[PDB]
Structure 1
Amino acid sequence: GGLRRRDLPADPLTLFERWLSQACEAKLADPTAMVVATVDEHGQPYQRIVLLKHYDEKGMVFYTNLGSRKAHQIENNPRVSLLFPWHTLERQVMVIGKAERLSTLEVMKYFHSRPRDSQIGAWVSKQSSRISARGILESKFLELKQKFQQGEVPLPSFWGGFRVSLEQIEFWQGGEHRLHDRFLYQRENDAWKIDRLAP
């Protein structure tokens, strides 16, 4: 019970790892689910949940449709925010950094790993665009589910991924009487500067 500075690891990822791990066993729904916030050209923020798929010193990775809104927004402003809503476990992890596209080699590797039906589904949806009916989706799906016959199901060209850099990582943990613990790890030079923040 409690979050004291003296217990903090030098690498915020160590702490994130332990927290991610504990969330998984705690059986949280989609412990890897995180809210990614992006900003459009008019300064208006936008949010949606995506799944964390990989992470290391280079940043956190998620995959998405390259014609989607989050994608157009990242292209005009690569500054993003990630928030892991683990409040059932009285925790929050917020990441701040820049989103950079993944090479086709990486994207390719991950795509040919997800459920065959999900690969077909990736083809079906022109993510974020306005469609006149649900049926359009259902048609295309069956029209491909068999057209591909599953021969391998090709990687759609409009399917990609992003790696968000770690410029800042904030940890929040529930505190009694409303006094929560907050620590901000801030990438500075070749290291991490840590500061406690008032709740």
Structure 2
Amino acid sequence: LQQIAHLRREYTKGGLRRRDLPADPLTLFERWLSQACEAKLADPTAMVVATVDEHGQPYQRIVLLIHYDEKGMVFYTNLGSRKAHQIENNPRVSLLFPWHTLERQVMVIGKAERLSTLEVMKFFHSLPRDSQIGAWVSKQSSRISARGILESKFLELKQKFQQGEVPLPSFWGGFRVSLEQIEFWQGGEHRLADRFLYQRENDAWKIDRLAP
């Protein structure tokens, strides 16, 4: 708890100049994610996902980043959830990594596309057994009349699955968010943040500094 405090002070010694930026924004994201992990932030892979309903109202919630590469950033969710309904009507989403403990933010803008069954199955059968079970329990985002509904169904499903592999719910899936824009924010001198926007354009990245 002094080792962690020290690491956070070192990773917060930030300037951020254009000439030190990598060509691929995911190189910088990888570096900051590794620092969030080493500094033991709570849930370093946690990201706030924003979606928009049919009335133009934005909604937000935290999800975990499970995978990223050039094709985008992946999370898993219940396909009957509010976020899945909103994505089906409007695939435009924003992701924000709230790394303000290290004076950082990352924001990703892109379109969410569903994962295939093969991808979902691979991830599901990597989860701890008790995570597989919980995925069955909850009709995510529906009104429920009592907490006991969850607790009862959890007990029943434990009993039902006890002596086999936990099957994949038909209602569990995932989304990959394309990399149209990636924005980096790092606290800077005189409380003037360094801010860079990577914009995907003509199979390349256009980088601009933004005023904070």
Q: If the TM-score is normalised by the length of the shorter chain, which range does it land in?
A: over 0.9
Give the count of matched residue pairs.
Answer: 199
Normalising by the residue count of structure 1, what TM-score does the alignment of the two structures yield?
A: 0.99
Gaps of 5+ in 1: none
Q: Deviations over 1:88-135 (max 9, x none)?
A: 000000000000000000000000111111111100100000000000
Say if 1:41 and 1:150 are closer, same or farther in 2 by CA, change over 3 A. Answer: farther
- Tell me the equivalent position of 1:41: 54
Once the two structures are TM-superposed, the CA of residue 178 in structure 1 deviates from its matched residue by 2.2
Call closer, same or farther: CA 1:89–1:150 in 2, change over 3 Å.
farther
Deviation by residue 1:57-107 (Cα, 9 ceiling, x = unmatched): 000000000000000000000000000000000000000000000000000
Deviates most, 42-51 or 150-159: 150-159
Structure 2 SS opposite 1:10: coil
Task: Say what the alpha-carbon RMSD is for the aligned residues.
Answer: 0.6
Q: Which residue of 1 aligns with 2:90?
A: 77
The SS at the match of 2:98 is strand
Q: 2: distance between equivalents of 1:143 and 1:150? A: 13
Structure 1 Cα separation of the partners of residues 118 and 187 of structure 2: 41
1:28 to 1:17, Cα distance in 2 relative to 1, 3 A = same
Task: Choose the corresponding residue for 1:181, options 173, 194, 197.
Answer: 194
Superposed CA deviations along residues 149-177 of structure 1, whole A, max 9, x for unmatched, are 14111000000000000000000000132
Q: Which moved more, 1:143-152 or 1:106-115?
A: 143-152
**Aligned counterparts of 1:102 and 1:36: Cα–Cα separation in 2:** 17
Equivalent residues in 2 for 1:1-199 (5 A)? 1-199=14-212
Distance (whole Å) between structure 1 residues aligned to residue 169 and residue 203 of structure 2? 38
Q: Percent identity?
A: 98
Further displaced range: 76-85 or 147-156 = 147-156
SS at the partner of 2:153?
A: helix
Q: Residues of 2 paired with 1:164 and 1:107: CA distance?
A: 15
Q: CA deviation at 1:148?
A: 1.1
Output the CA distance in 2 between the equivalents of 1:181 and 1:103: 38
Q: Distance in 1 between matches of 2:189 and 2:71?
A: 35
1:23 is displaced (CA, Å) by 0.8
Change in CA separation of 1:118 and 1:150 when aligned onto 2, cut-off 3 Å = farther
Do 1:116 and 1:150's aligned partners in 2 also have CA atoms closer than 8 Å? no
TM-score (norm 2): 0.93
Distance 1:69 1:4, change over 3 A: same
Mapped to 2, the partners of 1:23 and 1:118 lie a distance apart of 24
Taking structure 1 as reference, are residues 5 and 41 closer, same or farther at Cα in structure 2, changes over 3 Å only?
Answer: same
1:27-83 residue CA offsets vs partner (Å, 9 max, x unmatched): 111110000000000000000000000000000000000000000000000000000
Runs of 4+ in 1 over 4 A off after TM superposition: none
- 8 A contact 1:95–1:170 mirrored in 2: yes
Deviation digits for residues 12-38 of structure 1 (CA, Å, limit 9, x no counterpart) = 000000010011001111110000000
